[PDB]
Amino acid sequence: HSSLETQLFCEQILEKIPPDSEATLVLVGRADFLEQPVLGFVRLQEAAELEAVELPVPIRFLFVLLGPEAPHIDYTQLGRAAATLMSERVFRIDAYMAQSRGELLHSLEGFLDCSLVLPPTDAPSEQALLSLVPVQRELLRRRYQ
Amino acid sequence: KVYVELQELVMDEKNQELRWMEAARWVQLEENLGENGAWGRPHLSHLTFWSLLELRRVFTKGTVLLDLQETSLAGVANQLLDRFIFEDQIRPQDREELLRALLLKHSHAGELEALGGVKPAVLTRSGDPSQPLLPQHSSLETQLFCEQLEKIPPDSEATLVLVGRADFLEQPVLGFVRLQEAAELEAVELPVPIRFLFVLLGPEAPHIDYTQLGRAAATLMSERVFRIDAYMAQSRGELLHSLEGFLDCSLVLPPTDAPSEQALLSLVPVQRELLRRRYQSSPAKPDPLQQTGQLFGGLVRDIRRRYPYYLSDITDAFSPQVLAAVIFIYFAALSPAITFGGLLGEKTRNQMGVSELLISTAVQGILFALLGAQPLLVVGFSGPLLVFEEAFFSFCETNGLEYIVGRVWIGFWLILLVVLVVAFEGSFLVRFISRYTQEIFSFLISLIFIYETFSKLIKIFQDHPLQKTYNYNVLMVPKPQGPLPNTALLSLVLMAGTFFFAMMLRKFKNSSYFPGKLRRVIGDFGVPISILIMVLVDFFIQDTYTQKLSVPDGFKVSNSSARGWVIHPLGLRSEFPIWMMFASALPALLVFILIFLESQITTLIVSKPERKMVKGSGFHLDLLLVVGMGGVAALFGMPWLSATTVRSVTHANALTVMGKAQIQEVKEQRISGLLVAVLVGLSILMEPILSRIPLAVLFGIFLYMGVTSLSGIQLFDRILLLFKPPKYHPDVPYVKRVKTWRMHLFTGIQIICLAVLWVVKSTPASLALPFVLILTVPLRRVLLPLIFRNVELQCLDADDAKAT
Amino acid sequence: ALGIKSCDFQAARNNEEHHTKALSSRRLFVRRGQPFTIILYFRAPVRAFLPALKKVALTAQTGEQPSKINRTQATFPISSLGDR
Amino acid sequence: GERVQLAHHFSEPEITLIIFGVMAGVIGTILLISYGIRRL
């Protein structure tokens, strides 16, 4: 089936990329022979222009997510989560200075700590979405301080 | 809709006794209870990610008592704990203390203030509550919604969510109970029977906030799809399946360092699709310059844009800056009124004089402040209006015509003209006046103002030359009949002193000296302080003569034998000819173009986007008011006025609050202009005060206003850049994206236009200045693209100072 | 008309030539006494090369207080007559 | 008014009322003309 983001945003870069920008590559695939899903996180020692994957900016981070078909595991959505996590400033800073997996896991927990879940509400969409503006502002008043 | 109540095990403050206290309630929308004892503002429920993660974990291994035949909290708790032990969720040694906790007193908001408040508590093996060990986090709902019941349907059933912490527990436990028949319990004071019971007990654990756990369970119960599933579920798996769909249609919003409304509203299709997915399985179904093509459409939209802000237009004036602006603009509008009225009386043989101009300015300013869509404009006489008065007087005396009656008929035609223009939304032609014409006109008007002030000082020097000998017995009535010692030099000293003090206090406002608020105050009153200082200086020099402000003796016509307060359109002494009743349209035409151009260009300059005016400006209401008031005042032998540029710009600048170099806000209100107009009207009765104010102080004030009005003009900045080297040039789009010589060619073309307009103003044909100024619009719109690229024109001629 | 868009220091090639490639491929590490190559990019096309060359000089500084007497600051033109 | 003035048949309120009436009439005429056009 088609992804939700494609259905709601696709049926109908270098200018915006800042000069001192480094790329994160997220690789997502399904391998039926693997027993468990696996995550690989790579921070290169220095940003590199990988010839196999030409990007607008040099690659600094690599996310590898492989695994079999598992319950409640959508690998495209899993890659979207890892991509959004990289796009967030606080986790990205923690990823640059991370020296162990535990420091990365601590940053992910803080990312989940300052995360808002909107349940299915019957309210009008423009009111249901805009009701998150003051709640998110209070929830992020210390994360970016 | 149903009622859901969340109660948390807490200990009080007076007797340290643990009990249950309601923390939040749900009728679809969620209300929270603050520490003060009042319910907060109802809101849509938002859940933390950790609460839903933990709610799913306890619900997966949870305890479900469906269709349970009990009608009391004691009966429910006995059965709930009996199956807790049977499911190996709690040990039998824990049953005694857990039953004691559940059947406790359930307090509500009516006893929060009666007691000493509540603090969070953790149940111990001993009866006394333990103080929580994990770091406390104050509820986000209380901070955001609380620091400041008829919606329940008669047939609705309630749900009770109980959350409590007990240190003597291995893991958090969930108990779900659906009674066979909805019964009333002592826990809920509301007269609504209870069908469902959520019990969430467990130890202090990381990532588990039991208040958030209860909020998640109550939000899940408050959802329509889950509740229908809960009523029809005969097993735990059916409740689990409904929870999975609830999480499947949930929207998680990750943290971002740059929140915005537009990015948030990009998720409207996502929220709609998720809601559609949730209800696809349940049996329930989900519950100012534009032309509008309508007669008087611009006027009605102008009224609707500004009139709701009327309450703010009175309350926003309660600041000392407004009072200082009143004192400033009073002199800034009174001295030109006296000068132009004296010139009018001299030229028109006192048919129209100082008193008529004063009363007309007062009445029209009061009405414009009370009814105008842009109350920051100052309405008064101007130079071109004086030139028209002299030209019409010459024409009327040439063909033996009464001047004031011709003025009456010109105003009668003006009313028709402005009604036709407003009825056809003719003010939308103002949109073709870009930054080019606005800045050219503003620069020319400021230069004329400065030149006329210096010319007044020069004329003072010519009237009182510096000579070795003077006649000492010269007549002093009504003005110097000869040269006087020390007069011109003292006028120069007073003008220079007041200008210097005004500029020094302006720099003091932006300086870093004194308490900042006092410096801001002192700086706001800088012009009144300078005026007072130099008025005292001239006061203490008694021997020397300086020309003082002179106001009419009383509220009488400037010439008693020529006319009264009301003019007969058919004639005063001789019958007014029929042909001039129709021929007054052409001078009325010229007056309408003059007033329209001046007022609308002033409105464009004052209400620029970079000036930070959020209250809106009306281009249709103000033109109608000004021209109609002028046409009516013509019938009373009074001048028609216009929204002058220098006075309005000074008025807006005196109400502008500066940030910490950058415009922050403007005090847009109706009280300052109203008070200025009232003071102008009252100036006749303030003769003992105004008679001690010299004209040299006001000349220095005029020089200050002239040099101040050039602050926001990009033409002046580029003229400065002509004398300024390119490396110095600022980081602005017309410098960084346009070549320096192209920018200077643009500035030189504007300078040529300024020189042409100044030359035109120097000839007797100075009433053609509006048309030559209009000709700069075809220039920018046709000839400028023939030599400049679209990029260069976007950068140089920018409406809101944007880099294309 | 002599605005600068960017300057490429060519760290990979120069580090290879200067035997510092093991240090980095992104940061320019050079050894004294041996030439290294940079590429200067202009925002607009350069019409006259010789006047533009006459218009440009280069300055190299090291340390917190660079000066000529300490030999921590050198200003040199871009020309074929420079002391190699 | 003031001094010695010519006495017309209409007083000032009467003449200004008739002029306002004529102006309202011509304004309504132009408005009705504009309403007739842009429709047929």
Ligand SMILES: CCCCCCCC(=O)OC[C@H](COP(=O)(O)O[C@@H]1[C@H](O)[C@H](O)[C@@H](OP(=O)(O)O)[C@H](OP(=O)(O)O)[C@H]1O)OC(=O)CCCCCCC
């Ligand atoms: C006229 C006062 C007479 C002196 C009486 C003697 C008493 C006296 O006035 O000094 C103590 C008092 C200290 O109080 P304090 O430092 O808290 O007051 C600061 C002062 O108001 C600044 O002007 C403010 O900056 P700004 O401008 O608003 O941006 C600043 O706020 P912020 O913006 O930093 O948050 C304020 O905190 O004032 C002075 O600052 C020293 C200047 C002495 C003033 C001396 C002037 C001759």
Ligand SMILES: CCCCCCCCCCCC(=O)OC[C@H](COP(=O)(O)OCC[N+](C)(C)C)OC(=O)CCCCCCCCCCC
């Ligand atoms: C910031 C505040 C302003 C600063 C600028 C100062 C301008 C002062 C006006 C001078 C021009 C003027 O007005 O001179 C003109 C006068 C009048 O000549 P007249 O032959 O009588 O006129 C002929 C017309 N009749 C026939 C009607 C009489 O000349 C004089 O009496 C000469 C004395 C000039 C004194 C200058 C004072 C010092 C100025 C320098 C200060 C830095």
Ligand SMILES: CC(C)CCC[C@@H](C)[C@H]1CC[C@H]2[C@@H]3CC=C4C[C@@H](O)CC[C@]4(C)[C@H]3CC[C@]12C
């Ligand atoms: C737009 C305004 C100025 C109206 C246009 C003026 C013309 C159309 C009208 C307005 C009032 C009219 C006058 C009203 C009354 C009379 C008295 C009558 O015994 C002779 C004609 C005379 C004097 C009219 C002449 C035409 C007149 C002057």
Ligand SMILES: CC(C)CCC[C@@H](C)[C@H]1CC[C@H]2[C@@H]3CC=C4C[C@@H](O)CC[C@]4(C)[C@H]3CC[C@]12C
């Ligand atoms: C006499 C005073 C008032 C104004 C004169 C300023 C004029 C003549 C000067 C000032 C700055 C100058 C510009 C500065 C820089 C450049 C870039 C160069 O590659 C071409 C010429 C050009 C575009 C110059 C043209 C001439 C210029 C526009």
Ligand SMILES: *[C@@H]1O[C@H](CO)[C@@H](O)[C@H](O)[C@H]1NC(C)=O
């Ligand atoms: C007033 O008008 C009369 C006659 O119309 C005229 O003689 C007189 O000079 C006027 N007064 C003044 C001060 O000009």
